[PDB]
Design a protein around this ligand. Sequence first.
Ligand SMILES: N[C@@H](Cc1ccc(O)cc1)C(=O)O
Length: 455
Amino acid sequence: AGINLNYLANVRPSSRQLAWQRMEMYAFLHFGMNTMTDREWGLGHEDPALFNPRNVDVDQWMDALVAGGMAGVILTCKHHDGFCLWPSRLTRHTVASSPWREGKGDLVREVSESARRHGLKFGVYLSPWDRTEESYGKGKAYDDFYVGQLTELLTQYGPIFSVWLDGANGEGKNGKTQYYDWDRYYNVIRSLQPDAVISVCGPDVRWAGNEAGHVRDNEWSVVPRRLRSATVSSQDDDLGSREAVAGYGDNVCWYPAEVDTSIRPGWFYHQSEDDKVMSADQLFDLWLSAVGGNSSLLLNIPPSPEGLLAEPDVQSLKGLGRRVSEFREALASVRCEARTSSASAAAAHLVDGNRDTFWRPDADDAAPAITLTLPQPTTINAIVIEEAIEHGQRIEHLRVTGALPDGTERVLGQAGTVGYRRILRFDDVEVSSVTLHVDGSRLAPMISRAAAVRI
Ligand SMILES: N[C@@H](Cc1ccc(O)cc1)C(=O)O
């Protein structure tokens, strides 16, 4: 193997990136002034008197998120309109000036506390774009204000798992375009919350860039480093193939994808969209596609102006969670005999329920493969396979075969990348065994789990 391949096959996640990956799916909570004014885009300078939801019940939100199987929640602490959901000391444009809770409330506190009681991690979105704040457009003075608010959020509310950042901007009242001192912002986050992943407009987690309803066929976590300050764009179908990254040499990095979408057409709640909430089945397919396609899933659910998650959203979440649990429960009810093409001693690692142990074929194994034999003919429609990503991402082509009770065997399906998890789906079939052929790989693959199941 050449220097380049030895490099690519060993690019690896940091501690914070690995912990983040293991979350799999978490929620976004869009709630604030835009909810009250029924907008996707706020104008700024909205009257704080308009923020007076009568029945905020964050435990109702968290209850539904747990039932949905979420690992954490990212709250919109301040959106583009600039209204802050905590009583910031740096602006009067906050819940402290609203009639909500007699001006004595702190929704960031209320949410973070409830998240922790519910076993969910807590993250923040603090909008760089600010349509109210006076310093906006002045340059450094707005950076000072932003950093000031980051500091409040990152020091007063306990551990933060993610700081989510988009890059929208505009002109201030002075007519000048505000640009952000990203490097300065990153230092603050790294300093105050070392374990947090800085996401999207940050170096730790990449916006998947997919068209809604689509995920990459091949999602590589190892990609050109230039994608971190985002010729090539985040929306390209092929970011990480050998051909795509060839010319970049060592200028690549571990920069894993996050698929983000809303359960409704809009990010904020609009009553007119109450008949347009994704169903539990739509969410499940999404989960299977994202979390079964080497991407984390960020799912937005917006509370209504009353201060509750709406009934359809709660039901979809509940059904999503039920489908995910049924899937895992069947993935454990599975009785299989695992056999490998080499390193049979390590074959045990495929089924010990330890994500830290893996099977890796011998260097001279020219056809690495895992055979799973079933106690008797069973119907299956998917295989689950996971790489030991702590050590990198390597698999490039996977071919799955099934041995039918009727002597013969056929191809059940193929896939490219695996990474954190590949759930390969196909038509319901009855087999006595399946073989996973790792036809292509950057050096020897390290596989921590393999399984055949019926969804
Ligand atoms: N393209 C999206 C990105 C985004 C999504 C959610 C946000 O809260 C902020 C930004 C938008 O601006 O609408």
